[PDB]
Design a protein around this ligand. Sequence first.
Ligand SMILES: *C(=O)N1C[C@H](NOS(=O)(=O)O)CC[C@H]1C(N)=O
Length: 250
Amino acid sequence: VNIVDYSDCFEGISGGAIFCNTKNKEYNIYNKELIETRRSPCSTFKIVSTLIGLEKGVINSKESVMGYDGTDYPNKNWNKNLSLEEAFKESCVWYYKKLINKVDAKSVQNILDDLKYGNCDISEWEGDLKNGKGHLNGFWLESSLQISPKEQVQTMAKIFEGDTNFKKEHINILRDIMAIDVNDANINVYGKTGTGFDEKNKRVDAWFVGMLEREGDTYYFAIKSDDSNKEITGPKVKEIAINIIKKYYS
Ligand SMILES: *C(=O)N1C[C@H](NOS(=O)(=O)O)CC[C@H]1C(N)=O
């Protein structure tokens, strides 16, 4: 466990980072207090909810559809019968809500328990209804389920090192749809952003969680901001994460 200073890449934004290489067990941690604090995963939960849907047969491939019903949404790309790959990349809320609501709560509870997914608290299945957004809510979106960045990395490692019971075919679907382009062919980066606002503490929950492969070595990582500035989003923290990867992990 090495405590590190990535503050220059955070460019004044409050947050922390954790990178873990499980081959040689090198844990690099910036802002240890934050990295151990549990928070809502927000859209980073799509990593796990995709695998749940595949395991239960609700979806089957990166082409799989969820039966769009014509409801009007402000995001153009949500207004179509999109595939799993597109719903993941466009963070289509209705697709992932419909997917998870086809799965019984005990199945979800047991999978989260097996993954040690934070507090594994799905008690508020419906999510944070007081924000007025109705069915565009769920237990993983600023609601009962909370996970620390360190726990995110531990879960990512267990999934992608093949240490869970999820099918390899399903892991590979997730890998494909998580891959991102960082304009450096010499590293393979995979990840997912998340964005929420913590109304109790007046702070954002801005996430980028994923993994990095660079010549035999793999790092699992979670970058997280808790800034009070509402302008700080998941996509912004992904930029920060990319800067760290290029500076220290290339
Ligand atoms: C996930 O955190 N969400 C879904 C969507 N995309 O977020 S992302 O750009 O950080 O991946 C909008 C924000 C958030 C939500 N409000 O549900």
